[PDB]
Amino acid sequence: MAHFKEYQVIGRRLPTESVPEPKLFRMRIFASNEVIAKSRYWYFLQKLHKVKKASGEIVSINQINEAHPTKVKNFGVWVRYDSRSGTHNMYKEIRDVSRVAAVETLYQDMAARHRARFRSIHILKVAEIEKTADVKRQYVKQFLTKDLKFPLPHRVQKSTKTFSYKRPSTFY
Template sequence: MKPETSRQAAFSKVNMTIPMTKEYRIHGSAMPTEDNPRPQVFVGTIFTKNHVFAKAKFFKILEKKYKIKATKGLIIDCKEIPEPSFKEVQNYGIRFVYRSRSGVHNAYKECRAISKCWAIDHVLRELAGRQKLKRSAVDIISVDVVPVESLKRAKTIEFADENVEFPIFTKIVNTKSLLIPSEYNPSD
C-alpha cells in the first residue's frame, strides 16, 4: 500500500491557478535554396499549451496559406510572451474560427478576465463544454481589450458595471471565532 502523500499528489494533475494557454511569438520561413537564398520571414502569434504545439500550429497555418510544409520550413525564433500581471479585471473580445461537425465557423465571444491567456482559456473551456470542441479545433484570430461602452454581449455587460453586487444567500459562521474551551473540546 502506498503512503497517503503519494495518493494526494496523484489526485490533482491540473493546476487551476495558472492558465493552460500561453502566448507564443514565432518567426519562421521557407528553407533557403539556390533559387531563393533569402526567403520571406513570417511572424505569427499563437496561443497554445507549449512550444511544441505552437510550432505545429504555425506550420499548419503556413502550409494552408503559403504552401510551405514543415519539412521545407524553418523556425527562426519561438518565444513565450510573458503575461503582464494585472490586478483588475478587463473585458476581452476574442475572434476565432472553429471546426465543428457541420463545417467551419467564424465566431466572436466576450469575457471578463485578468489577462489575455485567462480570457482565451475561459473561452476554450466554454466551447469544450457547450459544443464539444477540442483546443486543436479552434484558431484564435485576435484578442482585444474592449472598453465598457463597446461591449455587445448581455452576459458581459451585466458584470461590467463598477458597482455590481453579488447576493449572499447563506451566511456561513466563522468557526474560528467561536471560543470552545479545551476541557470540552473532544479533539484534544
C-alpha cells in the same frame, strides 16, 4: 489542451540560392508548451502559404507575457470552429486579467457549449476592448455597471469529517 501560454513563433520558408533572406512570417500561438506551439505554427502556415516544416525552419519562438497581468480586461475573441455539420465563425467576450486566461476560458466554453474540442477551434483574434460601451455581450456588460455588488447566497462549506454535529447553515 492544457493551461495555456502565448508564444510568438517566427518561421522562414528556408532560403535557397534564388531566394536568400525569405519573408519571416510570425504568429501568436496559444499552446501549453513550445512543441505544440511550433506544431500549431506549422499547421497554420500550411493553411496560409506554400510551405511545410521540411521546407521551412522556425526562426524564433518566444513566450509573450501579459503586459498587465493584474488588471481586469474585457477581451473580444473571434474564433472559427468546426461543428458536427459545418464550419462557423463566432465572436465572444471574456473578462479576465490575461490573454492566456481568456483563451483558456474560451476553450472551456467552446467545449462546454458547442462540444468543440481543441483540434476543431481556430483562434482568429484576441483583442482587448479598450472602451466599455463597445462591449457587445450582455453576460460581460452586466459586470461593468457602477458600484457592482452581489451576494453569494447559499454558501456550502465542505466538511473535513464524515459526520457533523450541528445541522449546518448556508448563511453568507
